[PDB]
Write a protein that binds this ligand. Structure first.
Ligand SMILES: COc1ccc(S(=O)(=O)Nc2ccc(NS(=O)(=O)c3ccc(OC)cc3)c3ccccc23)cc1
Length: 285
């Protein structure tokens, strides 16, 4: 009975929605609003708890990048504040390894981070780990074989097709094979033994293409393209399928949710959010 949760986002301004989708019956739940509206945040789950990490509050008055970390408990329907990160990180990537949340890249104003920090929920503390090789914002992050992958993004000058691999036991990064397509703001997840990068922005157009990295062969391969081009999309995996939610298509903030089935290699539109939005954090619990 797991749900896909979607937190925050952007439509005219940063949003406070926490909504959940139930793929078994196609219904949506409206849950407790975020304390502070945020977009460009990342969502992850550790031990049944949903965490909303980083992002930005883009409001009528002004804009503030967020160093915040907040914890949503589905049992109690309440957000609680956690220890903040060392720096604000808008357009952040995040992965979880062994119960620890990794906050990768992102921006603070015009500073494009290569730093990486790790959150320990048992102790409510962030600690810096080794920095990435490249500054990356709008970076997609996936965890496979207890390694953390940082894919694409924007370094401050160049939009990137490069990707790198973090080794927690050695505390070191290495560059891996570059993608076929430059992508910032892509959706990045892991399904079966592969990293998928879906959509994003190549510096000219929003993309519908989708590629996957097979770790055995160290090669990126195109798979079936989404129906909508999209960047700043949310992404998750649920019962063996990839779900992509929202994003910006070049003209509209999308309410479309597409599902990818790897056995048929096809995308289908399975629901719509209650309103169109980009830059959401998404996770499953
Ligand atoms: C068009 O208006 C927008 C206003 C706000 C927003 S957002 O949803 O609040 N966040 C973001 C905005 C941009 C990002 N990088 S990008 O590569 O996708 C991109 C780059 C250039 C573009 O065109 C010139 C469009 C998208 C984001 C990346 C990750 C997460 C959030 C991003 C989205 C759209």
């Amino acid at each position: 009975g797991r749900l896909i949760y979607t937190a925050g986002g952007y439509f005219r301004q940063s949003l406070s929605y926490l909504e959940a989708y139930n793929p078994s019956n196609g219904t949506w739940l409206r849950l407790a609003d975020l304390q502070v509206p945020r977009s460009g945040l990342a969502g992850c789950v550790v031990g049944g708890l949903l965490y909303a990490v980083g992002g930005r509050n883009n409001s009528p008055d002004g804009n503030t990048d967020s160093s915040a970390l907040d914890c949503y408990n589905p049992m109690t329907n309440q957000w609680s504040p956690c220890a903040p990160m060392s720096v604000p990180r808008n357009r952040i990537g995040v992965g979880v390894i062994d119960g620890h949340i990794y906050a990768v890249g992102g921006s603070h104003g015009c500073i494009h981070h290569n730093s990486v920090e790790r959150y320990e929920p048992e102790r409510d503390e962030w600690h810096l780990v080794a920095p990435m090789l490249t500054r990356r914002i709008g970076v997609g992050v996936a965890v496979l074989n207890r390694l953390l992958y940082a894919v694409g993004g924007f370094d401050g000058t160049n939009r990137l097709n490069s990707a790198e691999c973090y080794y927690p036991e050695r505390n070191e990064w290495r560059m891996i094979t570059a993608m076929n397509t430059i992508r910032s703001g892509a959706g990045v997840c892991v399904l079966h033994n592969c990293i998928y990068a879906a959509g994003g922005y190549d510096g000219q157009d929003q993309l519908n293409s989708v590629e996957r990295y097979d770790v055995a062969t160290a090669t990126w391969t195109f798979v079936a393209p989404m129906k909508h081009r999209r960047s700043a999309l949310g992404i998750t995996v649920h019962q063996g399928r990839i779900y992509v939610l929202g994003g910006y298509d070049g003209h509209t903030f999308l309410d479309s949710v597409e599902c990818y089935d790897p056995d048929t290699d096809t995308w289908s539109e399975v629901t719509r959010m209650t309103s169109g939005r980009s830059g959401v954090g998404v996770a499953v619990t």
